[PDB]
Symmetry: C4
Subunit: 388 residues, 4 copies
């Protein structure tokens, strides 16, 4: 009944605890589980759910051949119950498309999916399970959005979109929606430039997004959004603890307003929680492939160009496949602070495991503890040989 | 709690955006999807659902052999969640039969199903999930109805039925129901010479139906119904943009008050939105077979016998199978106008793809935008070789 | 919120219309459909459902081998949505056992199931989904009940049980329940000589049951119950239109107070609607086997020992398998009378089709119309060959 | 809306009636049933459900291979409707891990799952479907809890936890939670210190738990908890009817304050209802294998070291597999007492049936009757040879 306001700060993060795990690929070896990728998690006032882009086929089904491809007519944003797998029978379609975001504002949920050919894509903004607003491509080259949840404050939900070639004229915009309607949009300003796949969280009347720089992948760009003024700033994480993938090795000194020299072609969606001495960064363990995942406590990573880890937690061993990662919180939990959470996408199949013809994932998710908990590791758990 | 009244006009149609798509044939290659045909979409105040006639078997089931046939004791009207497939586990039976319609009046849903042998069929009218009224065949020759949603105003829901020859004069009746009871019926009047499979929508306290003249016409008949006076008139779409299938080639001048000659004893369910300058027609791209689908902006198509397209949008390529098409709208959405929507039945299997022994379909659905959106095309997406 | 009272009479029955049909055997050929038998239908104030005894296995499962047998530890009373099949995934277990009844009193549902070995069986009486009362075997020989719905008036629900052979020591009782608690029971009085598998309906503050006399199968015994006084009477249907199976051929003159001499210790559960000139009897078409099903209008069948048919309706052809049949009505429908309904069990597999190792069924169900509707026939529709 | 208080005593137990049975291994031979072990039952105010630890795979799935192991990253606590099987499509995940407990307080449900490697495990405590509190391992050796439901009084829910090696000996604590927050914990005082797998019930403002001695057991430890004072006592069951497994043969005289001489370390989770002359003990029939199950009425078992059976009931034949057992009650039923219930885990596959590569279970569950009812036996019912 009331729109949520971001009235709390983050809980103290002393470690991370298991929150959700779906075991999708294991279970899908002998049940009707949809092929997916680009998962996330998002909460309503009364429920938290798993989200992803379906490929319009089961994993065992013959149509799973070809699912390495990102964009097709057969994809849809689906949601399903926390830690259940995305099955044909339990998965609810939010909207049709191959790039998405979604968030609840306290009264109802906004979901956004983009569909089309690369040169003629469009977003449809759904609100309360009905289409409300559409937005045509402005740069005619893969209009695309966060692939994780947005965040609202008093009914205003900023969303980050990008359109444009990997090398070409790109334009990133922040749209501000309320009940699925456009209040305002703005082109990206500050020092962060060639941005995508923003992972956002809200606290203390502000939205923080950690993104990916598509021109040089090393230290991540950050957007700080004021949802009342409908303004933003941008910058890079200064810490020499680099969190894109592939990435150079960690130097001694990082960069605050430019990317640290990195590659151009193909980073990874990732996230962080930037909160002074309560700062944690996530990254893949490998510097070159989407393998492993760990969380590192890096006090003042945002502003301190010499900042190094003072604590850590392994999530996924380096001998296991990871993937995209992103932030979410339960903005409707009890208590005096918001508990940081995140998910890691555990990609199985193509290209790394090319004895199968499909690509899919499962999900692991964690939230923060004020305790210093023991750590385990959380693999996907399926055996590729079983699918041969 | 209150009956819906058709108080709004249509939104301006500047383009069509993706609404829903179930990918049912793809998915059903390896999951328990029911064989269907004659699908449609209908909204309740709090939800929109897909509808179709089940064939009482899944697609991989051996009882899928013989499913090209229309009429059997194993068919039922089913609904399921929007953009999900019609599965054995998520499909709710509305009623039993092989010709149907369904609509919600704001307070509850009326569903109608006809069953029986060709010479002894009967309609059962359900309201609030209970049978209320039955109507026996009046001409003993395949009693049949819309195969897409009806429309209500202040509790009054007109429905079009036909009984008699598909290839000659037959007896069409317009029934007016409230709460599943018959308020009145009328025989068809106006200049439409033959009527089947009306596709209807409501606005400004009237219902417009675009139908199929199976006897002689390749232009479509139109019924316009006043649900307050409980009266109707009929004519043809005057436009030389002919919308049945098979059909002759578009002439320069159409016919308003008689069927456009050239093709007899055949046709396909279709629809249009006939709103002055805001008029759009749907059709198969091919003139010979149920392949492709396009929307064409044809100002005043209803009344103007020389009207040609001023804009268009491809929905399904002519290299892909289409099928029936129909109109629906969400009469309980927010805003100041009703947004026009339609679906296209994407038929797969027999008779065009006769290496399988079944006939089934998937659904694609679109709604109007006030923007000028980029177009995609939306095939069924399944590979027939996978079913062999 | 209020207990239902039986305040209406029966609608005029001029024909029967299709109500529900699950096509369960067809569908279960390639989906996870539970093996069942002894089905029925029962309504809540807001929903009608299908009920049956599960066999704790799917049809295609290897444990379907041996499901000809009636009594095992793996059976339960399950309910599921009208006209869906009983699947693993959608079936709700009401209670455990191999004989059942169930009814709603207007405030909550009572369900009764019996389990045990033949010499030591017991009923558990559940109300509002919790067990309330239990009753031990009184004759130590297959304590058993209706296998169709009971009927309630002002919260009193009579239920007929039997315990004992058709030979040895044996006793039928009518228990009167309120909120699952025993008010009173009575041993069978009247001219009915043995009794099982009663099929009941309510009207004008009375419950009429048509039962099965398993010593001699010809004309059916009938129990008439006053749920206010909690007393009853019994007699036989006088009509020479005989309705059990196996049965002798129809004579000229029937018997009112004894069975017309019939096939010994064999039977089928059946039903009738007894209402003067508005009397209809159901029966198998075959006099030898559970084959075909018809409805016959036999005015004053209860009291007129020469009454023959004035009207009829074929439900299942004699070249198709039938089974148990029973009565139910929607006591919470709109209008001024109760509409008579029935179901027929369509038994497939053993013993009549022994190339499969299983026994299961599907359901067809009809309700009365005041119109004279055309007739179809409603076979199960599965092909046994497909299961080989 | 209110916290439940334990204001009632136990009903008189004169026999046990069938309550629920899921037939999970039978059904799962040909449907998507999840592999489980460590089941139990727990009620909310409006529903009772089955619970267990999933193994993150179906039984027919290839990942069922290896499911003899207890502790993996692929386990979760799931719940599903009473007497349905735990399927991929109807199981709801409560939390992730490999040891659990769950209970409702009248207002919401608390669920505790522990995960981690043997030396670094942690509990997350969920309340109203959100994580609230975490507890790290205190002895670094398989932190572990009840594996059946907890009981609440006025919002306070005691839970027993164990950490430590069985040869340590191990340490036990009682935590007292309210709304998922720790009110208090205390170490095990008294005569029984080496305790695990507590099965609890509530009555007359106190909680009684029957457990497994992990040091030197035969007879079972008992903890009596006062949830208001948040204090406890401990002793052993004096009776010479020994209810662990393996165990020596029943002696004439038992032991109240020390374990009866028997096995080293290993045992089985079990339960009792200790209520003076209305006292019943559960045990496996077999002295050495998890085979069979029986209830024995053993007056004053708790306090009388010569007490022997005055009445019994076979639940599972000795020639059939059993497993864990535990107590639960419906604290929200009608009437003046709480009705004692329990479940038995029916283990199939490894180690006993090693011709399959998996280990799973089904459930049978019973509630007490004040009647003297006939007994049956309730096997799992699956044929292993079907799975080969
Ligand atoms: C990103 O996405 C974008 C958004 O989707 C996409 O843009 C869209 O592109 C599509 C594909 O091009 C466009 O869709 C087409 O729209 C056409 C209509 O629009 C054009 O034409 C009209 C009208 O033109 C007449 O009128 C004007 C005004 O007087 C004259 O100036 C013209 O010369 C012309 O006059 C002729 O016709 C008159 C009667 O109309 C006669 O009186 C006269 O004498 C002449 O003969 C113009 O208004 C339009 O201009 C406006 O928009 C354009 C952009 O498109 C601007 O450049 C311009 O400045 C204006 O703003 C425009 O030119 C449809 O006609 C077209 O559909 C036909 O073609 C397809 C095949 O392509 C057929 O499938 C379809 O059936 C239609 O053709 C059949 O039917 C007609 C009618 O009977 C027949 O004449 C024709 O021969 C053909 O018949 C044959 O096939 C039939 C089918 O099988 C069969 O049944 C018959 O029997 C027969 O065999 C199509 O829908 C779409 O609108 C664009 N949308 C927008 C918003 O721009 C963009 O491309 C995307 N980007 C990328 C990179 O992909
Ligand atoms: C049960 O569970 C618990 C709870 O989880 C387990 O305890 C946890 O154990 C893990 C594993 O050890 C710890 O994670 C590591 O944390 C460290 C940070 O902590 C260390 O450093 C702190 C800071 O030191 C600085 O300050 C001090 C004084 O101020 C000064 O002395 C020092 O020199 C420096 O200036 C120390 O404060 C801290 O000490 C404290 O904690 C100790 C226990 O951890 C305790 O003994 C102490 O007494 C004290 O209280 C401690 O020394 C992270 O640095 C580390 O992360 C690095 O290592 C992992 C591999 O382990 C790697 O994957 C990470 O990426 C990272 O290393 C890379 O990045 C570095 C930064 O650039 C770079 O230097 C490295 O060369 C390396 O980079 C290379 O690889 C990366 C990745 O591939 C690549 O990108 C690069 O380019 C390059 O090739 C871990 O996160 C947990 O914190 C700890 N938790 C707790 C609460 O204790 C416990 O072990 C479990 N028990 C059992 C039995 O198993
Ligand atoms: C479209 O749909 C419509 C609607 O469904 C279809 O029309 C329906 O058609 C069916 C099929 O014919 C009819 O069902 C049969 O009904 C008759 C009863 O109606 C007839 O008899 C009435 C009574 O006659 C008596 O009284 C009158 C005066 O009252 C007197 O004149 C007369 O001489 C006699 O003494 C007549 O009133 C009635 O006439 C009326 O209706 C006619 C329409 O039918 C109309 O033309 C007339 O103008 C008039 O208005 C009519 O003549 C049932 O008797 C019959 O049931 C018997 O036969 C079937 C086989 O068809 C069998 O399965 C039944 O069990 C039963 O016969 C067995 O039992 C008898 C009693 O013991 C016994 O005598 C028989 O020998 C036989 O016994 C053997 O078999 C059984 C079973 O296996 C075994 O147990 C025994 O031992 C033994 O071996 C049918 O139910 C419908 O009533 C009719 N509905 C309507 C509204 O019309 C229409 O056909 C469809 N259209 C198309 C084109 O397909
Ligand atoms: C229809 O269903 C109904 C209802 O369910 C069926 O009726 C039920 O029938 C069963 C099976 O008979 C009964 O269960 C048994 O109950 C007895 C307890 O009752 C007996 O003992 C009572 C007390 O006896 C003592 O006191 C009296 C004086 O008070 C003294 O005289 C006597 O010598 C003794 O010292 C008697 O009061 C009681 O009699 C009453 O009831 C009778 C009917 O049962 C009736 O005839 C009488 O007139 C009177 O009314 C009765 O005789 C349990 O003891 C028994 O459980 C033991 O036996 C089973 C094997 O069957 C075993 O599995 C159990 O563990 C247990 O035996 C083990 O433990 C003992 C204790 O330590 C030990 O001493 C045993 O040697 C044995 O130990 C061995 O095995 C275990 C496990 O493997 C192992 O751990 C040890 O190390 C060792 O190796 C049964 O539970 C039901 O109570 C009864 N219910 C009712 C209401 O009647 C009916 O039969 C069904 N009808 C049909 C047709 O099927
Ligand atoms: C939320 O915060 C805004 C400030 O921008 C305030 O106007 C609004 O009243 C607050 N919403 C409530 C009362 O929940
Ligand atoms: C709907 O419109 C009718 C007139 O056609 C009017 O009488 C009725 O009051 C309206 N329904 C409501 C209550 O919205
Ligand atoms: C039902 O009938 C009884 C009398 O037999 C009456 O007292 C009771 O209140 C009635 N229930 C209603 C009004 O629904
Ligand atoms: C439950 O009992 C407690 C005693 O600890 C009491 O204080 C509280 O008021 C009771 N709550 C109720 C009435 O539900
Ligand atoms: Cl592998
Ligand atoms: Cl193909
Ligand atoms: Cl057959
Ligand atoms: Cl076996």
């Amino acid at each position: 009944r009331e729109f949520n306001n971001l009235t709390k700060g983050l809980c103290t993060i002393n470690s991370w605890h298991i929150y959700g795990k779906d075991n999708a690929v294991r279970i899908g070896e002998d049940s009707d589980v949809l092929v997916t990728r680009e998962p996330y998690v998002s909460c309503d006032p009364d429920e938290c759910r798993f989200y992803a882009l379906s490929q319009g086929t089961t994993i065992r089904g013959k149509h799973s051949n070809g699912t390495i491809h990102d964009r097709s007519q057969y994809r849809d944003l689906i949601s399903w119950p926390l830690s259940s797998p995305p099955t044909v029978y339990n998965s609810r379609v939010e909207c049709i498309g191959w790039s998405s975001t979604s968030c609840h504002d306290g009264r109802a949920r906004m979901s956004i999916c983009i569909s089309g050919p690369n040169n003629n894509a469009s977003a449809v903004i759904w609100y309360n399970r009905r289409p409300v607003t559409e937005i045509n491509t402005w740069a005619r080259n893969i209009l695309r959005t966060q692939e994780s949840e947005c965040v609202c404050q008093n009914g205003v939900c900023p969303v980050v979109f990008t359109d444009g070639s990997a090398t070409g004229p790109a334009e990133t915009r922040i749209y501000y929606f309320k009940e699925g309607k456009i209040l305002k949009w703005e082109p990206l300003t500050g020092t962060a430039k060639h941005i995508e796949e923003c992972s956002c969280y809200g606290e203390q009347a502000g939205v923080t997004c950690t993104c990916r720089d598509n021109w040089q992948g090393s230290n991540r760009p950050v957007i700080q959004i004021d949802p009342v003024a409908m303004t933003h700033t941008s910058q890079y994480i200064c810490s020499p603890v680099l969190t894109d993938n592939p990435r150079p090795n960690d130097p001694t000194v990082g960069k605050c307003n430019d990317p640290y020299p990195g590659n151009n072609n193909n980073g990874v969606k990732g996230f962080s929680y930037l909160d002074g001495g309560n700062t944690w960064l996530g990254r893949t363990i490998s510097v070159a492939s989407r393998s492993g995942y760990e969380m590192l406590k890096v006090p003042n990573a945002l502003t301190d160009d010499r900042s190094k880890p003072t604590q850590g937690q392994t999530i996924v061993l380096n001998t296991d496949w990871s993937g995209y990662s992103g932030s979410f919180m339960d903005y409707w939990a009890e208590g005096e602070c918001y508990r940081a959470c995140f998910y890691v996408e555990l990609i199985r199949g193509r290209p790394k495991e090319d004895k199968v013809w499909w690509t899919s994932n499962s999900i692991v998710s964690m939230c923060s503890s004020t305790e210093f908990l023991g750590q385990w590791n959380w693999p996907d758990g399926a055996k590729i040989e079983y699918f041969l």
